[PDB]
Ligand code: BCL
Ligand code: BCL
Ligand code: BCL
Ligand SMILES: CC[C@H]1c2cc3[nH]c4c(c3C)C(=O)[C@H](C(=O)OC)c4c3nc(cc4[nH]c(cc(n2)[C@@H]1C)c(C(C)=O)c4C)[C@@H](C)[C@@H]3CCC(=O)OC/C=C(\C)CCC[C@H](C)CCC[C@H](C)CCCC(C)C
């Protein structure tokens with residue numbers, strides 16, 4: 072079934088591979104070659120997880136966990152029962168996500184829109200790839216990657232963080248947090264703003280964009296404008312993830328000691344290091 | 353335990369929130385249709401919400417959604433297959449007929465008004481106090497198509513007065529009439545404006561505005577639709 | 592061309608804005624124009640509106656900020672080199688547990704924290720009132736003030752409501768860059784690891800989801816800006832090919848979609864539920880649940 076306005080847009084073309092071979096839909100979903108690729112990768116991955124479940128000996132989603140090869144395996148293969156399945160599943164994940172991005176590009180070409188969405192999605196993919204591929208490679212083992220289970224991946228975040236003390240002191244992690252919180256703040260504000268203009272006090276006419284520029288200027292003395300806020304949210308979000316990937320790519324590699332002690336470079340600068348009083352003297 | 357009651361209650365709240373949100377997002381485009389325009393059998397598990405009415409400013413009336421959906425224009429496409437889910441082929445020239453990525457909606461044939469009731473978008477020539485304040489001023493630059501031929505020259509910028517931004521370049525063709533090109537589909541360079549989406553021979557086909565000092569929502573939709581469509585339909589003429 | 596930065600800026604007479612029921616006596620003149628800002632957003636700074644509630648908020652907010660600063664300078668022995676050196680290590684700390692919820696603590700050992708906190712309380716609520724009132728003068732709905740109330744909720748929980756219910760101001764967050772981070776870490780350790788708080792986990796889902804969502808939405812609107820997508824109010828009132836192509840990108844990708852008004856409802860809520868759930872998770876911690884690992888083992 073189709074949205075009332077949909078048919079005009081369901082024309083042939085836009086595919087990157089296969090010509091017309093996969094140029095069709097199932098229900099709402101566009102398929103394409105990368106739709107097919109995504110189904111295969113995803114379905115195999117789920118099947119391998121369903122199997123890796125029996126080898127672990129469980130069926131609760133809150134207990135299923137697919138743990139990577141242990142550190143002693145380095146960057147080599149592993150028996151399925153202890154690391155192999157993770158490794159194949161990771162290949163399947165990567166395959167599915169990249170295939171999902173490339174399918175988004177096909178959809179963009181058919182619809183005559185910009186490529187901003189797959190471009191944005193590629194930041195999430197890169198963050199995933201940082202944790203499971205780039206960091207573990209750079210550190211010499213698959214075992215530093217996180218396991219695929221609901222609670223077990225949180226155990227990993229906690230143990231990884233406390234390996235370096237309070238992980239709050241990672242400076243790239245500080246920047247990342249700041250973008251996350253700023254992004255959510257911006258999202259609240261955009262949401263509320265547009266809705267406040269479109270749903271005014273009872274009985275009144277829809278407000279206009281001039282009203283919402285006036286609102287923000289009355290309030291903080293600036294309005295970024297409607298093109299601006301959309302650029303902004305895109306930038307805050309993508310920057311949050313950029314800094315997240317960065318903060319982990321440097322941890323266990325460039326820096327591997329307690330993050331709190333990194334801040335000593337500042338306090339040990341010669342012009343004030345030896346001056347008595349304060350906290351650090 | 354109070355925390356157990358909180359979490360349980362919150363999940364029930366979240367389910368209601370998601371239901372409310374999905375039904376709110378069905379105020380356009382629903383009910384769903386078969387490829388022939390008749391109502392689909394399977395609407396999904398979310399019902400259409402109770403209509404709301406928006407009171408439009410400047411005496412333009414109201415919008416009540418959801419309401420009776422209708423394209424209000426002929427769609428020049430035909431089936432390529434005997435069953436549901438396949439593409440629909442253009443029956444003529446898709447750029448002219450406004451289908452595919454060349455599509456447009458029958459938006460209202462008036463210009464968008466600003467908060468004081470004046471036309472939102474004006475040529476800069478008619479916009480008092482407005483000038484280029486940074487960047488390369490494109491006014492006067494030749495305009496090049498994806499075939500690397502000169503399609504015309506830039507004779508003004510159409511600006512969004514309230515948002516103080518450039519929205520179109522008005523481009524004069526070989527025959528002396530002008531066309532609007534969306535600012536988002538041109539690249540201002542030091543010695544030219546380049547237009548990737550259209551080859552030079554397709555500039556005359558860009559839909560015209562009926563009055564030279566304003567543009568209607570309908571007209572913006574036909575222009576922007578038409579130049580986006582060139583990415584797919586002028587690809588044979590893009591070197 | 593991607594529309595992340597503008598290619599040409601234009602400028603005209605300062606936009607002085609809509610009038611509606613706003614008291615014009617309280618708007619300033621327009622500020623300068625920033626060509627820098629105008630590559631990305633708008634170039635115009637000001638005017639700003641500053642009635643009595645705004646003066647109040649702005650005065651208190653500065654008083655909160657200076658009170659922490661006087662204390663920081665004091666801690667630095669009034670030496671500017673030491674002040675810059677140790678800037679992130681200073682901390683204006685709340686009263687010790689023994690003073691409970693009283694105001695009897697000495698200035699140096701809790702009292703300056705109550706003063707700074709009192710000023711913060713006045714700064715935020717009056718800024719909340721301003722948020723509602725500025726919307727009212729323009730005939731707009733109160734969504735901004737209701738949304739701001741969710742962030743206020745976490746803040747009030749952290750520094751006021753939860754300290755009260757626990758019996759002392761020592762539970763509240765200290766004013767310092769590193770010290771408030773240590774407080775956060777300590778709070779999770781003392782409460783049996785916040786990763787086992789279901790409300791904290793939901794707060795994460797929403798914080799992550801806000802980034803997902805504003806990336807989706809920002810990219811989507813930028814991808815359809817070649818059809819006027821960003822003109823969201825008029826796309827609401829009169830659906831265009833921008834709004835149709837946006838919906839269909841998502842319908843074709845993930846099987847469902849939003850409207851131009853409805854995406855903003857997903858937005859306001861994804862964001863608001865961050866601090867809503869978050870504030871609940873914090874309020875329950877040590878009032879009702881001492882250890883989230885433990886509670887989690889009983890499911891309840
Ligand atoms: C005790 C633990 C430590 C700590 C240790 C760590 C560690 C360790 C890490 C972080 C990371 C992060 N931490 Mg920390 N952190 C702590 C305290 C905090 C606090 C806080 C207020 O205290 C905050 C706000 C944060 C914030 C953050 C973020 C900056 C970042 C997580 C987002 C991210 O990377 O997304 C990126 C997004 C992804 C990886 C998602 C990818 C999505 C993929 C591509 C798509 C999947 C599809 C899927 C299969 C679904 C399909 C099926 C259905 C159809 C849905 N931390 C404490 C002190 N933190 C992480 C980071 O930066 O990682 C790079 C990280 O590894
Ligand atoms: C980003 C930094 C850390 C990390 C730190 C944390 C912390 C800390 C928390 C979570 C939480 C979650 N994480 Mg995590 N998480 C990481 C990497 C991932 C990846 C990945 C492929 O890289 C995935 C899919 C998840 C998935 C999840 C969800 C199970 C849960 C809620 C997230 C959410 O709403 O996100 C935003 C996205 C949306 C709102 C869209 C919907 C996403 C849905 C919910 C994903 C379903 C995943 C499904 C259960 C498993 C895969 C399905 C396959 C088909 C088999 N995490 C990395 C390693 N994650 C929270 C939790 O409650 O854990 C129990 C939590 O507190
Ligand atoms: C070791 C530390 C613990 C931990 C301890 C805590 C604690 C403690 C808390 C959180 C909280 C949160 N944590 Mg945690 N957290 C951990 C691990 C993580 C990880 C991770 C990957 O490891 C992540 C992603 C998070 C993420 C999160 C967020 C979802 C949540 C905060 C939401 C928010 O926007 O707050 C930011 C928003 C505010 C603080 C609201 C502020 C509003 C006020 C009104 C603003 C006033 C401004 C003022 C006047 C200044 C004016 C400025 C001028 C105008 C310039 N945590 C570990 C396990 N976390 C908070 C929460 O809700 O938990 C349930 C919280 O209290
Ligand atoms: C870069 C900024 C942010 C962002 C952006 C973003 N995400 C996106 C997009 C964009 C622009 C999309 O276009 C795309 C989308 O379609 O969204 C609806 C997507 C998407 N972001 C998603 C999730 C997601 N994004 C996250 C993060 C973020 N996404 C950032 C904060 C997170 C977090 C923070 O944890 C999650 C969970 C998906 C909903 C969707 C991509 C769907 C997809 O790739 O589908 C194809 C693959 C499958 C259907 C299943 C694959 C199954 C695997 C083979 C097995 C599972 C392996 C996995 C590693 C197990 C992990 C278990 C967990 C318990 C840890």
Ligand SMILES: CC[C@H]1c2cc3[nH]c4c(c3C)C(=O)[C@H](C(=O)OC)c4c3nc(cc4[nH]c(cc(n2)[C@@H]1C)c(C(C)=O)c4C)[C@@H](C)[C@@H]3CCC(=O)OC/C=C(\C)CCC[C@H](C)CCC[C@H](C)CCCC(C)C
Pocket residue numbers: 252253255256259260263290291648649651652653656714715716718719722735736738739740741742862863864865866
């Ligand atoms: C839904 C939850 C999210 C959210 C939402 C939210 N926040 C909001 C709102 C909303 C909906 C508002 O309406 C309100 C607002 O006005 O936004 C623009 C606000 C707000 N969110 C704010 C901050 C904020 N929000 C945060 C978080 C969040 N806000 C969540 C992520 C955080 C975090 C992550 O910690 C912060 C720090 C404020 C900017 C603003 C409320 C303003 C306020 O209450 O101010 C009182 C104080 C003053 C007016 C004066 C203070 C003076 C300064 C302390 C001096 C600073 C000096 C400066 C650093 C030097 C440069 C200047 C020199 C020339 C002197």
Ligand SMILES: COC(C)(C)C(=O)C/C=C(\C)CC/C=C(\C)CC/C=C(\C)CCCC/C(C)=C/CCC(C)CC/C=C(\C)CCC=C(C)C
Pocket residue numbers: 656657659660661663705708709711712746747748749750751760764765766767768771
């Ligand atoms: C350059 O020098 C000068 C002097 C010019 C300066 O001005 C410099 C000053 C500084 C260096 C200032 C720097 C200040 C900071 C580093 C501030 C940082 C603050 C935080 C990180 C705060 C985080 C969290 C705070 C929270 C959660 C507070 C909540 C407070 C409340 C909910 C309010 C509670 C109210 C109370 C307890 C009083 C109630 C009393 C009644 C009578 C109602």
Ligand SMILES: CCCCCCCCCCCC[N+](C)(C)[O-]
Pocket residue numbers: 099370374394395396397398846847848
């Ligand atoms: C976390 C966000 C999850 C949102 C899930 C809501 C899915 C709604 C799907 C209904 C679409 C029905 N259709 C396709 C018949 O319209």
Ligand SMILES: CCCCCCCCCCCC[N+](C)(C)[O-]
Pocket residue numbers: 098099396845846847
């Ligand atoms: C938290 C993850 C939830 C994922 C749910 C995704 C919903 C997709 C809905 C597609 C509509 C399908 N059908 C067959 C109802 O049209």
Ligand SMILES: [Fe+3]
Pocket residue numbers: 261265808812823
């Ligand atoms: Fe928007």
